[PDB]
Design a protein around this nucleic acid. Structure first.
Lengths: 155, 127, 98, 78, 24, 60, 120
RNA sequence: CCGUUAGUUGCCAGCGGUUCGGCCGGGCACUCUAACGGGACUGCCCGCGAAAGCGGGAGGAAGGAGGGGACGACGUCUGGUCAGCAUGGCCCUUACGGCCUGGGCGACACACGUGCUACAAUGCCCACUACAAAGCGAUGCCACCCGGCAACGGGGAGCUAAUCGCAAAAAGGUGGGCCCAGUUCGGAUUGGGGUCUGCAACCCGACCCCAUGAAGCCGGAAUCGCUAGUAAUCGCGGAUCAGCCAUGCCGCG
């Protein structure tokens, strides 16, 4: 990215809820370009949110994400000596990136053997605001506060 | 009585034939959902109709040959679209906005010598 | 129904050479079913550019056999006139059949 | 590994069969380590070349079916 | 998988046919 | 050796297993393309001169 | 329940379970289950003494096994020592035997990695 | 992307006969095949600019180098190669030439590079299930029959190959199995029985089937690739070639 700003690569709407945010999340689930298998999972998992709660999946989903977005984080920095964990505001596009990435990672950290379940129970534990994703997210936010002393370096 | 647009996408070509009235869709002497059997995306190929409002009110007979499945899904998506603009020059100004009308040039880029794979380059060790 | 195959490394002197073979058969016979282009058999060579040890970097060489075909429905000698010797093919070949 | 003969060399057999009319010679030295040890023509000792020299190998019943090369190893300290 | 002579996958990878992947 | 050798590779020998190829100009054992009796080098050479017909600069 | 040698497979499917025998693989057990007509899906847990003997009988009989097999292998090799063929001194040395490289690899046949010094 | 030329590969697209296989009359529409052309120019609109141009909008398959190649200045590294070849010098000329048989280049206490196959459930097995995209084949590909669990062996039709064959695409989809285990993960190693090519497979071939089933539960310090049909992942072919140590390379999708 020396020359340009690079356009936020624009995604193909969810062919089932009509949501760009969803595809995004489907892609993060995908391994070796098995997009089919990936969507099976996301949807089978929306299945497991009715079969377990009254409310709409797209709604659990939107919400789980919201809780997992970090607002500040430490970026590393050169100074005369060694380095400084410099807290700074996290841009909206990145917030999204991190949320989804974290949901999928946290999901596959869970104990249940079948993927759609893991995805679901994590989605569920998130909107309630107590998944291991929201954990490794308060860890960031807290750590940006620990370092509040160095917030006079933000570019 | 009859309508045609040709779709292509990456080795795969679509023969589309629209007929008035109905809702059912043959592909290669097979039901749609029989050809694209639980392949999550297929429901996309007919999105050109959904956008015009002819959601149902057309029959479609289809040949489709070339390389592979998910391309064919898009191939059709062009056929359908092209075929129905040739049943209405007025079907431009709504299909073009979502551009179901652009061929989409993106092919397998070609394997280059010295690389492993077109871009993927071999493994440097330095020391 | 005389039907003839024509091979050639040279795509120009076939569509050229074996499509005078359509004048001298509509002008001197009767009905022709025009030149038909058979797909090509492309033999490729991959050669390491240097005499010694330069395994990445080579150069690509092809040898491309083009294939053209001609049908006429006229086994008379009002045709076999030009169509035996009346030449302009120099790196070409002929398959003769019915 | 074949089953249509036991691809054993002429020059050797000729020399064994012709030793098989009262023949008990040690002086027997081959170069065909490629030849199969053949059903029962045992008792003898054959000097097999390893590339550098021939080797006094005594031949027993338990060791038929094997090639001669198997008993004359070609490289040093192994 | 690909390493196992006695799987379908094994056979494919290896080029071969046999008991574990026949020729129809 | 490469003479008593360029020569020996011409005799039809006892057992056909021993039958090898050899670049017919650049008198040479390895990478001998069979359609040309030509060593990959003494080959890229003639190709460049056009002394092998139809043979060309490939590009796609 | 103790089929072969001194063998108690358990609680898993019999095709899998038969496996736990030395000299029985996925193939020889696919076989036994047909030549004695036992549904191979059945859990060992649940199957007739009838069946368990039909099995005992077929297996303990049809082929050499689990220990006195083991003994034949031990003694096939000590005989490969004979007067002493190649593959012999090779077993003697503990190095590969199906003619593979030794420069790199051969780790399975050699005790982990006995590292040394050298160079400049 | 579109057009013209062209009908043993395209089809009820349209109609008729179909033993219901485009197979048969029949047609090239379409798909394709391959030749030739057209098309994109900052040409058009708005805004900024002195200009070049920049940002945006139109229409268009494509828009500002649309995407990938071929193509490597003057020179640099006394770079590489005398073992491809050519060459000055120098040196051996019953031997530093030549011929053969056998061994070696395949050694193995160690150490590094590049890879392959894994460590599993987004997984593994077995079944059923055309989505085809380059190339090769008449001392060849080998359909199809029969023998064999199979490698393969009989037979044996077709193709000088858009006609016949390699050819199964694999990942996928459907069904069923395994249930978290060093396992139905993984297939190293070793025992055994065979197949093939070849004068010949000990050192030193690949392949099939039975047994044997190793380390490996995702890797320290380090460190490599890639910016889109790319990376990742799945197969397919070819060159050399009797066979093959190809997991390599060059290519296809």
């Amino acid at each position: 990215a020396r020359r340009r700003r690079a356009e936020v690569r624009q995604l193909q709407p969810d062919l089932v809820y009509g949501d760009v945010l969803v595809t995004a999340f489907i892609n993060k689930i995908m391994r070796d370009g098995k997009k089919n298998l990936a969507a099976r999972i996301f949807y089978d998992a929306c299945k497991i949110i009715q079969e377990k709660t009254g409310q709409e999946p797209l709604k659990v989903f939107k919400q789980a994400v919201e809780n997992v977005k970090p607002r500040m984080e430490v970026r590393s920095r050169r100074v005369g000596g060694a380095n400084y964990q410099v807290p700074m505001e996290v841009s909206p596009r990145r917030q999204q990136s991190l949320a989804l990435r974290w949901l999928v990672q946290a999901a596959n950290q869970r104990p249940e053997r079948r993927a759609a379940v893991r995805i679901a129970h994590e989605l569920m534990d998130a909107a309630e605001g107590k998944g291991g994703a929201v954990k490794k997210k308060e860890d960031v936010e807290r750590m940006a506060e620990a370092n509040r002393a160095y917030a006079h370096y933000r570019w | 009585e009859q309508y045609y647009g040709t779709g292509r996408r990456k080795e795969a070509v679509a023969r589309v034939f629209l007929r008035p009235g109905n809702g059912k869709v043959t592909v290669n002497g097979q039901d749609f959902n029989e050809y694209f059997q639980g392949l999550v995306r297929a429901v996309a190929a007919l999105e050109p109709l959904r956008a015009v409002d002819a959601l149902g009110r057309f029959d479609a007979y289809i040949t489709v040959r070339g390389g592979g499945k998910s391309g064919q899904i898009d191939a059709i998506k062009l056929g359908i679209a092209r075929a129905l603009v040739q049943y209405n020059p007025d079907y431009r100004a709504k299909l073009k906005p979502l551009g179901f009308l652009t061929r989409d040039a993106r092919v397998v880029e070609r394997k280059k010598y010295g690389k492993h794979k077109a871009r993927r380059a071999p493994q440097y060790s330095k020391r | 129904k005389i039907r003839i195959k024509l091979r050639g490394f040279d795509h120009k002197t076939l569509d050229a050479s074996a499509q005078k073979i359509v004048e001298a058969a509509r002008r001197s016979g009767a009905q022709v079913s025009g030149p038909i282009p058979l797909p090509t058999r492309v033999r490729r060579f991959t050669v390491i550019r240097g005499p010694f040890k330069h395994k990445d970097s080579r150069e690509h060489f092809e040898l491309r056999t083009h294939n053209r075909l001609v049908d006429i429905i006229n086994p008379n000698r009002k045709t076999i006139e030009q169509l035996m010797t009346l030449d302009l093919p120099t790196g070409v070949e002929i398959e003769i059949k019915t | 590994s074949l089953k249509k003969g036991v691809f054993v060399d002429d020059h050797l057999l000729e020399k064994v069969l012709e030793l098989n009319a009262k023949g008990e010679k040690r002086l027997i030295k081959t170069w065909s380590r490629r030849s199969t040890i053949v059903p029962e023509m045992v008792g003898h000792t054959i000097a097999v070349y390893n590339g550098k020299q021939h080797v006094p190998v005594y031949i027993t019943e338990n060791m038929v079916g094997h090639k001669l090369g198997e008993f004359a190893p070609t490289r040093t300290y192994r | 998988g690909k390493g196992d002579r006695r799987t379908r996958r094994g056979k494919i990878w290896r080029g071969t046919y046999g008991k574990y992947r026949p020729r129809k | 050796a490469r003479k008593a050798l360029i020569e020996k590779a011409k005799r039809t020998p006892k057992f056909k297993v021993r039958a090898y190829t050899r670049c017919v100009r650049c008198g040479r054992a390895r990478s001998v393309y069979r359609f040309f009796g030509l060593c990959r080098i003494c080959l890229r050479e003639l190709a460049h001169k056009g002394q092998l017909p139809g043979v060309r600069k490939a590009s796609w | 329940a103790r089929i072969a040698g001194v063998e108690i497979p358990r609680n898993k499917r019999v095709d899998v379970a038969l496996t736990y025998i030395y000299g029985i693989g996925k193939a020889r057990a696919k076989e036994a289950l047909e030549k004695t007509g036992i549904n191979p899906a059945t859990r060992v847990k649940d199957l007739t003494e009838a069946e368990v003997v039909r099995l005992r009988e077929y297996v303990e009989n049809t082929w050499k096994l689990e220990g006195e097999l083991r003994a034949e292998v031990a003694a096939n090799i000590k005989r490969l020592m004979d007067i002493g063929c190649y593959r012999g001194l090779r077993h003697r040395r503990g190095l590969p035997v199906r003619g593979q490289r030794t420069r790199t690899n051969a780790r399975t046949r050699k005790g982990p990695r006995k590292t040394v010094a050298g160079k400049k």
